[PDB]
Amino acid sequence: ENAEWESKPPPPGWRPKGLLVAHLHEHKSAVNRIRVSDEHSLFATCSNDGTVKIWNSQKMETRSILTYS
Amino acid sequence: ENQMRYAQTQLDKLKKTNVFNATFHIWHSGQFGTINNFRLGRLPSVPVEWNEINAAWGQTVLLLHALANKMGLKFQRYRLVPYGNHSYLESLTDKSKELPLYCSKFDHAMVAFLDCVQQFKEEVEKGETRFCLPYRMDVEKGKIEDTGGGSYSIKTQFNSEEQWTKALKFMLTNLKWGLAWVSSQFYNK
Amino acid sequence: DMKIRFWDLAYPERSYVVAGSTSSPSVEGTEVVQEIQNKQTPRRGPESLPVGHHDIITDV
Amino acid sequence: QKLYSRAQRHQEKKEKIQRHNRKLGDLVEKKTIDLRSHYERLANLRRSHILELTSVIFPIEEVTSISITGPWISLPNNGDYSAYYSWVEEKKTTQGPDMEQSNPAYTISAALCYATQLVNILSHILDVNLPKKLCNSEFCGENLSKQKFT
Q1: For the cross-link Glycyl lysine isopeptide (Lys-Gly) (interchain with G-Cter in ubiquitin), what are the residue positions (chain B)?
Q2: Considering CB atoms only, which of C43, C45, C54 is closest to B2?
Q3: Is D138 exposed, middle or buried (0-12, 13-18, 19+ CB in 10 A)?
């Protein structure tokens, strides 16, 4: 009865304008998935370079706050 | 393939755009002439700030200077002193007095600038017999005249901005063709 | 196609390309939203850098 | 009898897909070598184009201070622009005359102007998306206020 689709849905009438905020390239090759923590505090992107990189959502006014390989 | 086609696109856009054409772009809108989207002169119907005109000179001075510097042309009468907000000229034969191109004097600087344009034009015309300029210049009078027979003054004193801004556009239109010639001699080498 | 599309499932005529400005070419009983590209020089300011991606986008 | 043909045809499919897989990996290998050549052609063209850009229009030379377009325009190496800030805050409260062309408020503005233009040209040549959207007009116009300048 009460399963919310999103922990934080888009703002009302949200319309992404297309303004680039951060251009990131810390991955040596193709990124395979982007997942956002349900808190939306962090997100992570994994890549064919065998590394995964974790990013601070609030720092997208940029750096891979954490990395694993 | 997408990465390769992108790199190919970058190569093509670089080859199509010599260093000068990338550093300076020249166009117009009505009576306004523009270098790097800075308008030179002002319409009588528009309160254009002198600050913008000073910036437009800072570009035009660097443009004409750099074009000569690349071509190896050394000026005979004046030394261009490019400043983004306070461009002026230093005469090679008279360094005791000066007059600036920025406004907020003035008149000897505008003609001295045309003197540099004349010296540049003579060097470009010494190039190929096929080169000409659409607007005539009389540095002795301080005037610019069209051919495709109107006459206008680059001296703004004892005149009005409408006749003056057109003459600035005309002069910039000459520099457009000058830049095109310089690029045509180095874009493929 | 490296073009982010915002699709409005309630008012599909309002759907638009997010990954690009207007410099790009604008656009069986099943409710199908069809995108048809419109059948569309003065240096009105400099050309900006392409802000979008230049390779296959893999996730959003 | 339907399974014997299936075992045959599935085995032929396994052989065909395996052969196709081999040719794709080899094709990507070859296409990567070409992409490497493209990126090096672009790197060489960019660097040659940039070297021309500085040697012809934006010469950068050091004399401690560093200059752009020529020695008449320069900025201090330590980036301790507190001198200009002091003249700005002093002039904004007690205005004074611009008696000489070498005034700090003149040369410094010209330096930041050509610097902002150079970085924008470099940005286009290098195809680098800048993190802070900036344009040459930011250093043109009136003498910048403490807020907008900083």
Answers
A1: 143, 176
A2: C54
A3: middle
Q: Output DSSP code: residue B154.
A: S
Q: Between D123, D124, D129, which is nearest C51 by CB?
A: D129
One-letter amino acid of B10: Q
A10 Cβ contact partners less than 8 Å away, ≥ 6 residues apart: none
Closest listed residue to residue D121, CA positions, set D59, D14, D49, D67? D49
C55–B contact, CB cutoff 8 A: yes
| Dihedral, B156, B160, B166, B167 alpha carbons, nearest 10 | -30
The amino acid at residue C52 is G
Which 37-76 residues of chain B touch chain C by CB within 8 A?
37
Residues of D at the A interface (Cβ-Cβ below 8 Å)? 129, 131
Chain D hits for A23, CB-CB cut-off 8 Å, are 129, 131
* Residue D36: both structure tokens together: 């490497």
The answer for residues whose C-beta is within 8 angstroms of residue B11's C-beta and 6 or more apart is: D38, D41, D42, D45
D22-to-A48, D3, D10, D16, D17 alpha-carbon distances in Å: 20, 28, 18, 10, 9
3-state SS class at C12: helix
Is beta strand B143-145 parallel, antiparallel or unpaired with respect to B136-138?
antiparallel
C51/chain D closest Cα distance in angstroms: 7
φ and ψ at B119, to 5 degrees? -60, -40
Q: Give the three-state DSSP class for B142.
A: coil
Q: Give the resolution value in Å.
A: 3.2
Measured CA distances, C25 to B44, B140, B175, C19, C35 (Å): 38, 51, 33, 12, 12
Please report all neighbours of A, defined by 3+ CB atom pairs within 8 A: C, D
User: How far is residue B77's CA from residue B100's CA, in Å, rounded to a whole number?
Assistant: 16
Return the residue of A nearest to D131 by Cα: A22
- How many residues can be counted in chain D? 150
Choose the mutation target among A23, A60, A63 for the interface with D, i.e. most D CBs under 10 Å.
Answer: A23
Q: Decide if B145 contacts B138 (C-beta within 8 A).
A: yes
Nearest in space to B40 (alpha carbons), one of B161, B182, B159, B179: B161
The two three-digit tokens of residue D146, written as one number: 């403490």
Reported in sequence order, the residue ranges of A1-69 that DSSP labels E, i.e. its strands, are 31-36, 42-47, 52-56, 66-68
Method used to solve the structure: cryo-EM
Distance separating alpha carbons of residues A55 and D118, to the nearest angstrom: 31
